[PDB]
Amino acid sequence: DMIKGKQGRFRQNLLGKRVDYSGRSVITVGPYLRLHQCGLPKKMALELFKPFIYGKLELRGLATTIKAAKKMVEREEAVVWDILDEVIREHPVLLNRAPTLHRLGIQAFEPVLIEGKAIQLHPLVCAAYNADFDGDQMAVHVPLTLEAQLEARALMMSTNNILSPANGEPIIVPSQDVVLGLYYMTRDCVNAKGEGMVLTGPKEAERLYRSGLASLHARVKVRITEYEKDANGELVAKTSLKDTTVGRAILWMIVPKGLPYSIVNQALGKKAISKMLNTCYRILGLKPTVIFADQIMYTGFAYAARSGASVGIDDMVIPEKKHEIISEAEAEVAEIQEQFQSGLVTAGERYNKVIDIWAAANDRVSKAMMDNLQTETVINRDGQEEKQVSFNSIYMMADSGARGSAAQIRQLAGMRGLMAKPDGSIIETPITANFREGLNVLQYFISTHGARKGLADTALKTANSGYLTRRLVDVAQDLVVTEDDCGTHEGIMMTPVIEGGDVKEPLRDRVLGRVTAEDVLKPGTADILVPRNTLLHEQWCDLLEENSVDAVKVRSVVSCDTDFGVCAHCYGRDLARGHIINKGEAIGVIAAQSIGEPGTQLAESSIQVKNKGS
């Protein structure tokens, strides 16, 4: 029993040790921080770095011996705090959050001494940690040796890990407040103060906004000088007059040179911001992307605060024609039930009919609510009136992609649809009321059942996930990249998976960053498009898009020739960095983590061709 088992050994004391120089505390927002830093309470920092303090105190000669250094720390004089500030300067610390699902559960930050007993965590990384500020705690370790310092700053630093190891897409995307602020900033209105005046640049736009002589969103013609690296790395300024809003210019102040103005010209929602970050990374590189993200955060918070967006009870308007629709559907259900009591239709048929008519009524009310709420701002220009995409705060929260989906909008202001009984069968009468109104005992009771089942599901799902990912990481641990290139020509012929109706996933994304098994020819023979095995980066993928290559044989890890591991070429590039895989990287563990962590949310008569083809 002592050897075997969890409590006994290997798991507990030989894979699950208890390190020194470690702490734990509650996490907090701290918006003013830079992306690459973290707020650390004074007293814990002093306790951790005690021996460093003693060493430096003795080096400076302020204390003759170690006991005098201890006494000097226990008095806590100004000199001690100055030495602590000086030693902490470039020393990085490791932050960890209890369920380390993937490799982003441990990251390094530079600490900044602060008052208080709470750790301050940079907002952008919360998504990576799956961290929430509701009493979650985090542990903090200190790397001691020089190699540890170099490792923390090089491999683990926040700015070096912007791409998820699972897929190439960015992890640090703005979450909720930032996107709301930016959305508020970029949306335009038909008529406001300062409509159509011409500004020489963003600086006087800000002059106007801060002085209250012009609205933050108002259509205007501005002269702007964008830069484009179209030549072989030279930037060419093109300067012209565009018709935009004040807000988009204000945002434009931050934006680095390389990006087209068009990027900001639109509504700038969640998707738009994500692809903005993507383009900024692909064109300029890492450092501009980091600084641009920080600027975006700061400006979003500031102008979100200036907006003053709130939520009152009258902000969610019950559609006027709900009651009619419901009474009509009730009359229809009554007619179908009476026509059942005479016995011309089975019970199941009546069941199906009622469920379908109720679904139709739900769709009707939903569409009526969206029509009512969406475009209701009938504000007036000089003379006659006009209508435009409303500025209703709940509507902006829906449309921006900041919080909520159409389903939740329905759940707030419409009827909250059908429910499932324990066995999965659907109750005949739905919940016609919404949270703005009041439910009654039955409808509540039903929804209570729903929520209970949901919660229990999440619990068991988490347990099963954890277990599965543990097995996965266990099996694939020993696989290592041992050789540079095995030199095989073999590979798997990869096509775009066209499941039924259309192209669920295109080729270009499917092939990006894979080396080719053999040269592919244009649709006309002897027109080699790609030499023997080349790593397919974005430029090659776009080149393939310009042509009409359909299927590409690419070297796969399974067919790799290397003994006892894999070679760089057979694997490919994809990483948090962009380049070909480096020899030595443990791809087994990264693969297992990447597969495990997301695992917590888990008639036919005629064919009809959709597009004109052979």
């Binding site: 004391n13 120089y21 709470a118 705690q137 919080r403 509540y444 059942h449 209970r452 983590q593």
Partner: protein, 1340 residues
């Protein structure tokens, strides 16, 4: 209204009139324990039942019977409060009357001797307090009720997972209250198998064999016969027409001269009707048809005797021929319809190896006791005691009721033991349902789940103690001599008290009271746990068990249950529910007389509820119980639909009866999603009492019920007038009505000040009333923790504004203004207890003296001569809490050295200190000290002060009562002295004590003066003896454990202020961590200049669909607006008239309201007082489902002269510029939860390491490091981080030389390392080598 109610009335919205008032909330515990003790004649539930169950105890044929008469509960030696103070269990001695009777050894039976024992003492039984809890060692414990499967028989399906080929195999399980389990299951081959509790599955018929039934009897009892007659030729069969249902014809079915079914045509419905109307009984049949059947009985050759065919043998031509020639006209075959009627007992008999009774008993014995040769009587006794012994196997009265109901018998009362007819009917019902003429039971039905409360479990455990002691006494009375011993050497109290204290103390369901909130206590006491003994484990339990059954309606709360891993297994009980006579759950409903909705209420259980059509509570009734709508919405068999007015049988009592108390406390529940209500309630039960609780601006009205029913408030028992008010006691003069005629006196209530609760919170009571105020029975005298004037005030109500403020409320985090900490409104007091124990070692007892080796006089400065801290001293971490010395032995000093010691004064006995020190990093004030001395030659100095402090108070109380009685006696002495010669001039000016020595003319009057003098003496002498007794009880040593000389307890109290990192929450499931304290100037302010208190993120609303907070904010803004208006009108003091007009127009506010308030109070004073209490804002009461609609909120906002839309224009406190689009502001009632950052925060650099594996200690008391688990290792491996992981693995934890070398190297300002091999690996090597395995570290 009552007086405390007249003090501050709460404006109640709500349209429907409350017909039933909330019952006593603690009914369960009190009623159950009352039923448990309950000295009663007729043996019902109660100790009496146990005694009669176990008694009479007869010797092993020794003819010495022992009889039981009755028992008596001794008077507790220690009252509740003093028992808690002194750290002993509050209990009563149990005394039982017994008789020993000895007969004549060799004569007709007749009592030779009967001796009656003088109420022998058989141990102590703990008593329950007034509130329904138990003090077990000076700690308050709660015994949670347990939900479990009721005894009886259940028929389950268990399909899907049966070999994954369908084959739904049914099973009947018989579970008794006391005894082994019985199980009947099927098999793919339709053989019905029995499996003793948890063994292999045998053929069922064996049990029928054990019951003494022969094969022919069984085949008679179970299968339906089929008759083949031979009349004049060829095999004619007696046929019941209705049997032909569904059968393709295999032969030509001719009958009575006419072919009916042609050979080959399947019998059609036309043919079936023809044959039925024709009344065909017998039909001739071809011999091929019979050439396949099976024989029922064992047909022997009656003439010669030789057997031919056996019972249940397949027929062959030779057997048919022998039968036909033997002369057998009537053949009985079996009916095996492979579709409906199967050969089940037949096939079981084929697999059944046993034939005779003896072989069956042998097989049973070889199942129960494998390996020992079975002897007949051993098997007989084993089998008898297994399932049919009254003592071992008992179902219940309830078990029997369920058993008879399952087999559809009208009779409820049966015999406990399992009779054979029972088993046969059970197997019949099982095979019947297997055919499909019956329904399976649902485990989740509350009709199948019974509640075992405290008294029942205590009774069971006590019975177990009795069976132990009975076997023991049995043996002792058998072996030992009969007539020598008296009935007290024979009975030992040790096992009874041992079993009872084991159950009460170390059990899963007996747990510490969750004592930080009144709500926490009250909800903890009314809990129903499915864990504990005979309960499912959480991991094993299926999702189906943890679902909410439609039966829970109005009995258990669907929404209040911990959201942790054991979600769904707790299910706090609803408000109005009660326990049945049998321990089931029943809920009230109002009767419906065909048209009128009457007022008589009936309590219905689950099954009874299932049948009827019950109307909803929120149905509109006008003045006579008539429905406004013609078709109303009801539920009849667990499904809702529309019924006509004159169809409803019952109607819900009130909207609240579905939900528990916790959910009923949340306002605007109707607008909150069930999930967020769940989390809100679960968290809200963790709130900590603040310094001065005030009240919720938005409540539900249930607050007074909860506060009163919990025992935290002080409530008047007999109404009277407040005589004396102090912040320690309230003294009341009783009213003459309730005043006892003989020896009444007055009532005195001593309050309890700051003591430590289980959760380390403060428990302080404040007086409400003032001198000379009249109080009535049931008013709130003193406020308990976090309650005001009778109302629950869990937290405090502050002005919130919903807006994002420079991303400081980014996520659920919360921003708070420095004004909140300045005003000191979220600061809580906590309380740690510390204990120093001085035991007796064999090298010598340790000492408490102040002479402590090599300590500076700084440490002694704060200690008195006795060695105890001064009361009121401020201490810090590391200071010596108390002084103790460890004895030192075998010093063997040289004589010159001894002389030196003598002159210097050095003590050989000491040289070591065991003195307790304040834990690291905790600093507070010593508020209290207690001393417990097991042996002590005399009371210690400190003991004397503490005894006098308690004593003087007790003395004061007795003196006060005595002084009142003396004043009365003196008044009466003056009234007698006035008779017999009036003397009022001289008397009143001479002292009162000079009235007994005075005289009067010799008459009966002199006799009366002597009477009153003797009464004066008697009152003095009774006072003195009661006082002496009380002082002897106080002084005596409180019995401590063996080996401990004495104990000193010290209480520290610490004031913790709110700071960044603490967790704060609302009532609707919104959470957050306080992120920053802003200066007053930065906070937003309205035009008027009032700043907001909390700035809360709006984005928490849409995805977390809790809309209750928005309505709460609006209504709270309305209430504070009215309160502001009343404060403004009151500061100028216009006149009573204006105030009355304004308050009346406010209190009315429309119509249809059940309020009826104002204008009955004294025209000026009581109105002025009520205005003073409401000037801070008028408290509202929105009930759960009969709540305030939007229009009413709009009206209330208008009455205050505020925007009806609930949004205001706001100015940015930092910049001064206006915010676009006005924002929602208003007051919300928020709570501070028990998760305080200073308790959570923790760090270590280097410290103590563990003994065996030289890793740093685990824990918080000792510094302790974080656990770098395998997942983190994997995380590091995903990176190329080899050196960090290496140092983390060896230098940081496990390498001893490595850690010291690294410490020195770091100190030197160099950063390298020397990894070495971890010590734990060496431990692993040593442990593997301890087996027979040689594992060596090779080298080359």
């Amino acid at each position: 209204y009552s007086y405390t109610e007249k003090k501050r009335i709460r404006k109640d919205f709500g349209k429907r009139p409350q017909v039933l008032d909330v019952p006593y909330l603690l009914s369960i515990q009190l009623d159950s324990f009352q039923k448990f003790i309950e000295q009663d004649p007729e043996g019902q539930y109660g100790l009496e039942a146990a005694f009669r169950s176990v008694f009479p105890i007869q010797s092993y044929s020794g003819n010495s019977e022992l009889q039981y008469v009755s028992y008596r509960l001794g008077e507790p030696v220690f009252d509740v409060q003093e028992c808690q103070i002194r750290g002993v269990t509050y209990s009563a001695p149990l005394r039982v009357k017994l008789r020993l009777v000895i007969y004549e050894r060799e004569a007709p039976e007749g009592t030779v001797k009967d001796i009656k024992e003088q109420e022998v003492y058989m141990g102590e039984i703990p008593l329950m307090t007034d509130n329904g809890t138990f003090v077990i060692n000076g700690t308050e414990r709660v015994i949670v009720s347990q939900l479990h499967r009721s005894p009886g028989v259940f028929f389950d399906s268990d399909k899907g997972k049966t070999h994954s080929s369908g084959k739904v195999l049914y099973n009947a399980r018989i579970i008794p209250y006391r005894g082994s389990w019985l199980d009947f299951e099927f098999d793919p081959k339709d053989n019905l198998f029995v499996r003793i509790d948890r063994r292999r599955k045998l053929p069922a018929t064996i049990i029928l064999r054990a019951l003494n039934y022969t094969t022919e009897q069984i085949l008679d009892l179970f299968f339906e016969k089929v008759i083949f007659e031979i009349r004049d030729n060829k095999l004619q069969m007696e046929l019941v027409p209705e049997r032909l249902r569904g059968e393709t014809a295999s032969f030509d079915i001719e009958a009575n001269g006419k072919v009916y079914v042609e050979k080959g045509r399947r019998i059609t419905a036309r043919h079936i009707r023809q044959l039925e109307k024709d009344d065909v009984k017998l039909i001739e049949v071809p011999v091929e048809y019979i050439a396949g059947k099976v024989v029922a009985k064992d047909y022997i050759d009656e003439s010669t005797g030789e057997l031919i065919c056996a019972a249940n043998m397949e027929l062959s031509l030779d057997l048919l021929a022998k039968l036909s020639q033997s002369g057998h006209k009537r053949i009985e075959t079996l009916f095996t319809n492979d579709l409906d009627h199967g050969p089940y007992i037949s096939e079981t008999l084929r697999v059944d190896p046993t034939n005779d009774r003896l072989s069956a008993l042998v097989e049973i014995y070889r199942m129960m006791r494998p390996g020992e040769p079975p002897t007949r009587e051993a098997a007989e006794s084993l089998f008898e005691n297994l399932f049919f012994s009254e003592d071992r196997y008992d179902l219940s009265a309830v078990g029997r009721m369920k058993f008879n109901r399952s087999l559809l018998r009208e009779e409820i009362e049966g015999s406990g033991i399992l009779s054979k007819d029972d088993i046969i009917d059970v197997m019949k019902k099982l095979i019947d349902i297997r055919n499909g003429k019956g329904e399976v039971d649902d485990i989740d039905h509350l009709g199948n789940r019974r509640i075992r409360s405290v008294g029942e479990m205590a009774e069971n455990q006590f019975r177990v103690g009795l069976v132990r002691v009975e076997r023991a006494v049995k043996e002792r009375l058998s072996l030992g001599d009969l007539d020598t011993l008296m009935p007290q050497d024979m009975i030992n109290a040790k096992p009874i008290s041992a079993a009872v204290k084991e159950f009460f103390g170390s059990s899963q369901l007996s747990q510490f009271m969750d004592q930080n909130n009144p709500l926490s206590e009250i909800t903890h006491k009314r809990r129903i746990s499915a864990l504990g003994p005979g309960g499912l484990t959480r991991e094993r339990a299926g999702f189906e068990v943890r679902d909410v059954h439609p039966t829970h309606y109005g009995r258990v709360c669907p929404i209040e249950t911990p959201e942790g891993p054991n979600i769904g297994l707790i299910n706090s009980l609803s408000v109005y529910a009660q326990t049945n006579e049998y321990g089931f759950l029943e809920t009230p409903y109002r009767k419906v007389t065909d048209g009128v909705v009457t007022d008589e209420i009936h309590y219905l259980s689950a099954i009874e509820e299932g049948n009827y059509v019950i109307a909803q509570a929120n149905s509109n009734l006008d003045e006579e119980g008539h429905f406004v709508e013609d078709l109303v919405t009801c539920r009849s068999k667990g499904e809702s639909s529309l019924f006509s007015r004159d169809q409803v049988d019952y109607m819900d009592v009130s909207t609240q009866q579905v939900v528990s108390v916790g959910a009923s406390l949340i306002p605007f529940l109707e607008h909150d999603d069930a999930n967020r209500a769940l989390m809100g309630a679960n968290m809200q039960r963790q709130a900590v009492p603040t310094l001065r609780a005030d009240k919720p601006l938005v409540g539900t009205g249930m607050e007074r019920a909860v506060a009163v029913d919990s025992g935290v408030t002080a409530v008047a028992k007999r109404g009277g007038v407040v005589q004396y008010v102090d912040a320690s006691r309230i003294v009341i003069k009783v009213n003459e009505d309730e005043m006892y005629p003989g020896e009444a006196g007055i009532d005195i209530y001593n309050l309890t000040k700051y003591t430590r609760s289980n959760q380390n919170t403060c428990i302080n009571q404040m007086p409400c009333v003032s001198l000379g105020e009249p109080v009535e029975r049931g008013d709130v005298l003193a406020d308990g923790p976090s309650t005001d004037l009778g109302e629950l005030a869990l937290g405090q109500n502050m002005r919130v504004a919903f807006m994002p403020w420079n991303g400081y409320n980014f996520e659920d985090s919360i921003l708070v203004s420095e004004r909140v900490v300045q005003e000191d409104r979220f600061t809580t007091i906590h309380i740690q207890e510390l204990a120093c124990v001085s035991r007796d070692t064999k090298l010598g007892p340790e000492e408490i003296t102040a002479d402590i080796p090599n300590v500076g006089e700084a440490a002694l400065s704060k200690l008195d001569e006795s060695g105890i801290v001064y009361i009121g001293a401020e201490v810090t971490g590391g200071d010596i809490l108390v002084g103790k010395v460890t004895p030192k032995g075998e010093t063997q000093l040289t004589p010159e050295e001894k002389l030196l010691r003598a002159i210097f004064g050095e003590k050989a006995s000491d040289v070591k200190d065991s003195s307790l020190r304040v834990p690291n990093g905790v600093s507070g004030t010593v508020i209290d000290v207690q001393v417990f001395t097991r042996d002590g030659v005399e009371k210690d100095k400190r003991a004397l002060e503490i005894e006098e402090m308690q004593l003087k108070q007790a003395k004061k109380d007795l003196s006060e009562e005595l002084q009142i009685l003396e004043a009365g006696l003196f008044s009466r002495i003056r009234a007698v002295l006035v008779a017999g010669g009036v003397e009022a001039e001289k008397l009143d000016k001479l002292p009162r004590d000079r009235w007994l020595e005075l005289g009067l003319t010799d008459e009966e009057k002199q006799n009366q003066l002597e009477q009153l003098a003797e009464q004066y003496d008697e009152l003095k002498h009774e006072f003195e003896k009661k006082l002496e007794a009380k002082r002897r009880k106080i002084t005596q040593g409180d019995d401590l454990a063996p080996g401990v000389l004495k104990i000193v307890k010290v209480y520290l109290a610490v004031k913790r202020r709110i700071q960044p990192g603490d967790k704060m929450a609302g009532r609707h499931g919104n959470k957050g961590v306080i992120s920053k304290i802003n200066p007053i100037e930065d906070m937003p302010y309205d035009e008027n200049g009032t700043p907001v208190d909390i700035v809360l993120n709006p984005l928490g609303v849409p995805s977390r669909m809790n809309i209750g907070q928005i309505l709460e904010t609006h209504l709270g803004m309305a209430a504070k607006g009215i309160g502001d208006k009343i404060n403004a009108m009151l500061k100028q003091q216009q006149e009573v008239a204006k105030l009355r007009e304004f308050i009346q127009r406010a209190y009315d506010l429309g119509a249809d309201v059940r309020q009826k308030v104002d204008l009955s109070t004294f025209s000026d004073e009581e109105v002025m007082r009520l205005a003073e209490n409401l000037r801070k804002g008028m408290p509202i009461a929105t009930p759960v489902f009969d709540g305030a609609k939007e229009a009413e909120i709009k009206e209330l906002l208008k009455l205050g002269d505020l925007p009806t839309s609930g949004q205001i224009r706001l100015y940015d406190g930092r910049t001064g510029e206006q915010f676009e689009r006005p924002v929602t502001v208003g007051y919300m009632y928020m709570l501070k939860l028990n998760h305080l950052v200073d308790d959570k925060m923790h760090a270590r650099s280097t410290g103590s390491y563990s003994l065996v594996t030289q890793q740093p200690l685990g824990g918080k008391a000792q510094f302790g490091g974080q656990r770098f688990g395998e997942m983190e290792v994997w995380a590091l491996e995903a990176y190329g981080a080899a050196y960090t992981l290496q140092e983390m693995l060896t230098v940081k934890s496990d390498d001893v030389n490595g850690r010291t070398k690294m410490y020195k190297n770091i100190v030197d300002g160099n950063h390298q390392m020397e990894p070495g091999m971890p010590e734990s690996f060496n431990v692993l090597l040593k442990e593997i080598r301890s087996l027979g395995i040689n594992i060596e570290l090779e080298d080359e």
